[PDB]
């Protein structure tokens, strides 16, 4: 789970390997986030770290405000786009993967989140749920 995350997180499909680009889902001005590392990722030979819905990752802003360029900041994935097994008994996926930049404490930078927010991420991140207008 790591710092900021509340409670335990059940494993889901990892659809965001390191180096993946996901559209920004917050009004902070960023367009897309380039993932360079995954927080809490496992250590294994030749295995590329991968993120998932609700995971905290460090990503750089490839496009958007110039002030946000050249610096890597933590981010929380709100969409994955890869089917994952929900314990309710249904496989679901989002139209496009997306994430929101956040501080190490999980606080949200943007005042609003655009598009649907995954249920797992909202439950695991109280601030994301508070800043999410649409869940699932």
């Amino acid at each position: 789970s790591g710092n900021g995350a509340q409670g335990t997180k059940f494993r889901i499909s990892l659809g965001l390997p390191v180096g993946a680009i996901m559209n920004c889902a917050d009004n902070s001005g960023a367009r897309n986030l380039y993932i360079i590392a995954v927080k809490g990722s496992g250590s294994r030979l030749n295995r590329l770290p991968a993120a998932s819905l609700g995971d905290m990752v460090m990503a750089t802003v490839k496009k958007g405000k110039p002030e946000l360029r050249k610096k890597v900041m933590p981010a929380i994935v709100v969409r994955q786009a890869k089917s994952w097994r929900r314990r309710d008994g249904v496989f679901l996926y989002f139209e496009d993967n997306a994430g929101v930049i956040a501080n190490p404490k999980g606080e949200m930078k943007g005042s609003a989140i655009t598009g649907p927010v995954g249920k797992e991420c909202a439950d695991l991140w109280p601030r994301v749920a508070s800043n999410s207008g649409v869940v699932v």
Binding site: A122, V135, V136
Partner: protein, 244 residues
């Protein structure tokens, strides 16, 4: 009066709970410490129900309601709705809503008389909310903040908004809601006032991180303590000036 409380290790009281003037909702996560914390102030005076919404502990943000009724998102299962209804008296209306938005607690900020809604909320949802809650509905944003349900707290005694609210915006919103408003912070400077605490006409619950000045401001604005209907806020002016 105002009482400090915390979730497992989260100061966002409003995320995992929803307190009204006649009923309270809490999450079933972990243990009954949150339930016991609420009981220590409300006891058995009003029902306290352990309930989940869409299988999550964020029922506070997912649901919005008042003394007259409660609203739940479309994602709520029928079992949860039935449990909530059975745990609540018939005097509290319960009905599911169908719209693009799902975060009713973040999309709707309302009290027993006046309600604020997201500007993009559909006409049918607005009409249903008005009919169920018996409250006036207005399209507004708190100083450009579209999430009225998360960045503002409202009650019949008073309301609280995030510190970035402009003075003109505060004046307009106070007149529209017919209640006093004060720009402040909760949980040691947290800007999400609507998620960091819950409040009603006679009880307020906030995170442990809430500093003494913030708790005093909340008490003064929401008129919890006896003989403190913002009257003592005048004395708090010097304290705020010194701290600020």
């Amino acid at each position: 009066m105002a009482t400090r409380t915390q979730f497992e290790n989260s100061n966002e009281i409003g995320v995992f709970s929803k307190l009204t003037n006649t009923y309270c909702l809490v999450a079933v996560g972990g243990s009954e410490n949150f339930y016991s914390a609420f009981e220590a102030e409300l006891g058995d005076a009003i029902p306290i129900v352990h309930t989940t919404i869409a299988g999550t502990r964020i029922i506070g943000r997912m649901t919005a309601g008042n003394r007259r009724g409660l609203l739940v998102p479309t994602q709520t299962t029928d079992q949860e709705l039935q449990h909530l209804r059975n745990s609540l008296p018939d005097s509290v209306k319960i009905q599911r809503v169908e719209e693009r938005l799902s975060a009713l607690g973040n999309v709707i900020c309302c009290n027993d008389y006046v309600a604020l809604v997201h500007p993009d909320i559909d006409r049918e949802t607005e009409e249903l909310i008005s009919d169920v809650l018996g409250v006036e509905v207005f399209r507004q944003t708190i100083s450009g903040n579209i999430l009225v349900g998360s960045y503002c707290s409202l009650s019949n005694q008073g309301g609280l908004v995030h510190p970035q609210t402009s003075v003109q915006d505060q004046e307009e919103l106070s007149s529209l809601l017919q209640v006093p408003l004060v720009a402040g912070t909760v949980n040691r400077g947290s800007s999400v006032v609507g998620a960091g605490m819950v409040v009603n006409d006679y009880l307020a619950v906030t995170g442990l991180d809430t500093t003494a000045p913030e708790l005093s401001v909340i008490e003064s604005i929401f008129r919890l303590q006896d003989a403190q209907p913002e009257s003592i806020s005048g004395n708090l002016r010097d304290t705020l000036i010194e701290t600020y």
